[PDB]
């Protein structure tokens, strides 16, 4: 459901911004996702560096416009795989760091608005593929957990 993906998206932004995580901590799926996405983001940032330097992410609306443009090119051939889904999280980690430097508004809670539209994109555009490929715990985790 939506609430599950919204939680993964918020946890990943929390990981990128190094904001503390209390108690129970992230679920095993969240921890596997954070480890994989952190490594993809390192590659993505280097490859998209010129694009990132060209843009002014002054607000959540600007971040959404840029996210929409990047998703349209990322999925141009129509194919979905776990690598491309991890790339969606890597891109939200990149947008939140741009917002941290360039956002005009003094609003720290903008990451929850970012997590929200990213999760609605993952659900609306890739939700049927995720359900066909085993879901998060029985598909994503099984593929990316250490053996
Ligand atoms: C980035 C392009 C190059 N080379 C490119 O690959 N465009 C793809 C595109 C995009 C949009 C926004 C971003 C990001 F927000 F991360 F910055 C990345 C990619 C879907 C459109 C680039 C490089 C140098 C100068 C301009 C650009 P733009 C942002 C005008 O495409």
**Ligand 1 centroid to 141 CA: how many Å?**
31
How many CA atoms does the CB half-sphere of 36 hold within 13 Å? Answer: 22
Tokens read off for 3: 């609430």
* Ranges of each domain in the chain: 1-147
Task: Say if residues 114 and 99 touch (Cβ distance below 8 Å).
Answer: yes
Residue nearest ligand 1's atom 26 by CA? 51
Please give the resolution of this entry in Å, rounded to 1 decimal: 1.8
- Closest listed residue to residue 38, CA positions, set 86, 107, 75: 86
- Closest listed residue to residue 30, CA positions, set 52, 4, 56, 67: 4
Query: Rounded to a whole number, what is the distance in angstroms from the first to the last CA of the chain?
Result: 28
- What is the distance between the alpha carbons of residues 104 and 57, in angstroms, rounded to a whole number? 9
78 φ/ψ sector (left φ>0, alpha ψ -120 to 50, else beta): left
The string of DSSP codes covering 57-105 is: --SHHHHHHHHHHHHHHHTTT----HHHHHHHHHHHHHHHHHHHHH--S
Residue nearest ligand 1's atom 31 by CA? 51
Residues 6+ apart with CB under 8 A from 12: 30, 33, 34, 37, 89, 92, 93, 115
Burial class (CB in 10 A: 0-12, 13-18, 19+), 100: middle
Question: Is the Cβ atom of 48 under 6 angstroms away from ligand 1?
Answer: yes
Task: Say if residues 60 and 113 touch (Cβ distance below 8 Å).
Answer: yes
Task: Say if residues 93 and 17 touch (Cβ distance below 8 Å).
Answer: no
For domain 1-147, the question of CATH label 1.10.437.10 is answered with yes
Task: Say if residues 90 and 7 touch (Cβ distance below 8 Å).
Answer: no
What DSSP state is assigned to residue 27?
-
The atom number, within ligand 1, closest to the CA of 94 reads 16
Residues of 22-57 as b/e, b for ≥16 C-beta within 10 angstroms? eeeebbebbebbbebbbebbeebeeebeeebeebeb
- What is the distance between the alpha carbons of residues 89 and 95, in angstroms, rounded to a whole number? 10
Tokens read off for 93: 């980690």
- Closest listed residue to residue 86, CA positions, set 116, 130, 49, 47: 130
- Closest listed residue to residue 19, CA positions, set 115, 125, 142: 115
How many CA atoms does the CB half-sphere of 56 hold within 13 Å? Answer: 2
What method was applied to determine this entry? Answer: X-ray
**Ligand 1 centroid to 127 CA: how many Å?**
26
Question: Is the Cβ atom of 55 under 6 angstroms away from ligand 1?
Answer: yes
What DSSP state is assigned to residue 145?
S
Task: Say if residues 13 and 93 touch (Cβ distance below 8 Å).
Answer: yes
């Amino acid at each position: 459901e939506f609430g599950y993906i919204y939680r993964l998206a918020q946890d990943y932004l929390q990981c990128v911004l190094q904001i503390p995580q209390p108690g129970s901590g992230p679920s095993k799926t969240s921890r596997v996702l954070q480890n994989v996405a952190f490594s993809v983001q390192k590659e993505v940032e280097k490859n998209l560096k010129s694009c990132l330097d060209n843009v002014n992410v002054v607000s959540v609306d600007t971040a959404r416009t840029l996210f929409n443009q990047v998703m349209e090119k990322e999925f141009e051939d129509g194919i979905i795989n776990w690598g491309r889904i991890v790339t969606i999280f890597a891109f939200e980690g990149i947008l939140i760091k741009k917002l941290l430097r360039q956002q005009i508004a003094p609003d720290v809670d903008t990451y929850k608005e970012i997590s929200y539209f990213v999760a609605e994109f993952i659900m609306n555009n890739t939700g049927e593929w995720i359900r066909q490929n085993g879901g998060w715990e029985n598909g994503f985790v099984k593929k990316f957990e250490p053996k």
